[PDB]
Amino acid sequence: HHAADYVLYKDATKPVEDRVADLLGRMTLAEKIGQMTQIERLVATPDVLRDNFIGSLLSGGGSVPRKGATAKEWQDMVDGFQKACMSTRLGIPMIYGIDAVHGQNNVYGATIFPHNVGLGATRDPYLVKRIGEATALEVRATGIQYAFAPCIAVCRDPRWGRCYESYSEDRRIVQSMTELIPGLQGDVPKDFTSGMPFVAGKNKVAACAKHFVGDGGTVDGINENNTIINREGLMNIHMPAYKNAMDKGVSTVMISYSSWNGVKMHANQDLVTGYLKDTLKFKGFVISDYEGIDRITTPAGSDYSYSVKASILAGLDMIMVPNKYQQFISILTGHVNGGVIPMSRIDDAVTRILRVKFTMGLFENPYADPAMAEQLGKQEHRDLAREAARKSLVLLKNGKTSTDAPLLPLPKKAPKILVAGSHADNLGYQCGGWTIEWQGDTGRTTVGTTILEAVKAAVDPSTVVVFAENPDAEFVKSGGFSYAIVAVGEHPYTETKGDNLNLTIPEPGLSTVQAVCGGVRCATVLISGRPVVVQPLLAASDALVAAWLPGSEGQGVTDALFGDFGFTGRLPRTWFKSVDQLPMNVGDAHYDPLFRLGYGLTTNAT
Ligand SMILES: *[C@@H]1O[C@H](CO)[C@@H](O)[C@H](O)[C@H]1NC(C)=O
Ligand SMILES: *[C@@H]1O[C@H](CO)[C@@H](O)[C@H](O)[C@H]1NC(C)=O
Ligand SMILES: OC[C@H]1O[C@H](O)[C@H](O)[C@@H](O)[C@@H]1O
Ligand SMILES: OC[C@H]1O[C@H](O)[C@H](O)[C@@H](O)[C@@H]1O
């Protein structure tokens, strides 16, 4: 269609499938393998990206251009990588991915939303959708076009260090929370064919249903381990939300490190190709986890050549290498030149990657929009996060005995009150893993409001607020307090670091609760990524609130504690009596919960 030098793949008015076929037909083998290669920004340089025809970059947890970097620093980093990719012969823009799993959580100043488990407590899919919307804007504020979210694992055992990333042990709740997808990506068209990728354009991002499949069903919740269960159980529990993701046009799927009945997911052709691609009709791209193909073997990386062959023949399209890109490209190249991996497999992988890039508009807007910088940490997104945090809270107890005055809601006006505990004034603890650092961190890591600051922000100006992290019972008994708010719980963790057979909160925790509650009527705010052993906290406490990992906006906690809103959350998981009951999920014959899934007390606004 006219102009000197016309190249159909560069024509924005053409259909995606023609632009894909047109571009695919021009590419060398090296250009093709390039597209299949995702590398860490930590190893990337303009020359590396140009010379290896690289298709994708990522930031892993904690991989930032620097500490405290502004939105525009992120945009400059991404645009600098992108300019190297656009200067290739074919000018194929790279796509940059990051774990924005509760907001754009690696970035200083980004709104941090509650983690998934707390979101499942809300039973509010429209809320999760609005969060996907906000998170897409804060990701695009940093120039990034691709979020590795949602995690739609169905965590069947909270001893797993990723239970907090699962909305529920019940797949129906997880299915309903796949509304994150159209939030991140935009709503699919009226027509839409299930399994096609969709992103609306430059204010949205490609999403990633992960980790396929059965990540939440491992033996003893051991991370990355073996999910021992029949096809019918896999399809009834772990698969269904992937079908909802197909219907919402999810752009990519990431494969799990985990195994199904002893078969590595990264080497499972029947599931990845037979099921995901040929039965669900997924037409987006399939991406490995981080060094996921290495972990196919034991030890990991001990036959990288087999890892490439296995993963690529299984049906994976893009490999999150992410460091050893030279080996990866050299080996896949040798497999193809040797006729061990057919060119049809390479072409299918590249078709899929290009299909997502054209569809999302990446060829038309390869570069960041500087005007989006101000979306980062935007007050309206914080207000949404605050609404979420509040809705995620589950009131487990409100009065020590059924005859006591309900402690909650607390009055805003009182002569003097006490805020206490390891988690009452620690932003990093309230956000948990995947915040600033991969494992999360302690202290004031970003912009946010702690529980202490929120209480000071909410109380009547005549109310005196005292903070004491770990006071003794005498300090409390002597202080003239009307009541105390005490926050304790788990420390931030992520992945295998959080696998935990005992599920008891660290000390001091319990002993601060007991010291405070023994001296004044107390409301205990428990911060955790999962149910933990809770009977001793309960026995000590007048009221107790499971606040999960509510994120950066601690005013969500106080909004409920002080009665601006009534408590509405309900447990999205079973609260066990003991870890030796585990696993124990709603619907088991088995079933003897301390609090059943769905449990939750309410209050009225004041
Ligand atoms: C499961 O965990 C044990 C270590 O606790 C390990 O020996 C085993 O290989 C793991 N299985 C898989 C499939 O990852
Ligand atoms: C909640 O609201 C209703 C009034 O509509 C009332 O009956 C109930 O006592 C209120 N208070 C509490 C603490 O439930
Ligand atoms: O899978 C392991 C890796 O994934 C994460 O995203 C991190 O950035 C890296 O530190 C960690 O080792
Ligand atoms: O950081 C990139 C990836 O690495 C991690 O190890 C996780 O398993 C995955 O969920 C994440 O998207």
Residue numbers in the entry: -3 to 602
Paper text:
In the barley β-d-glucan glucohydrolase, a glycoside hydrolase family 3 (GH3) enzyme, the Trp286/Trp434 clamp ensures β-d-glucosides binding, which is fundamental for substrate hydrolysis during plant growth and development. HvExoI folds into a two-domain structure consisting of an (α/β)8 barrel (domain 1) and an (α/β)6 sandwich (domain 2) with a 13 Å-deep active site pocket embracing the subsites −1 and +1, positioned at the interface between the two domains. HvExoI catalyses the hydrolytic removal of nonreducing glucose (Glc) moiety from a broad spectrum of poly- and oligomeric β-d-glucosides. The crucial role of substrate binding in HvExoI implies a pair of the aromatic Trp286 and Trp434 residues that form a clamp at the +1 subsite, which is positioned next to a pocket-shaped site at the −1 subsite, housing the Asp285 and Glu491 catalysts.
To find out, if the Glc molecule alone adopts similar or different dispositions at the −1 and +1 subsites, we perfused Glc into WT, W434A, and W286Y, and compared their positions, which at the −1 subsite were identical in all instances, but at the +1 subsite of W434A the Glc molecule was disordered (data not shown). The Glc molecule entrapped in the −1 subsite is held at the bottom of the pocket by at least 10 residues. Notable was the behaviour of W286Y that showed increased catalytic efficiency values with (1,3;1,6)-β-d-glucan (laminarin), laminaribiose (G3OG), and 4NP-Glc, while these values in W434Y were considerably lower.
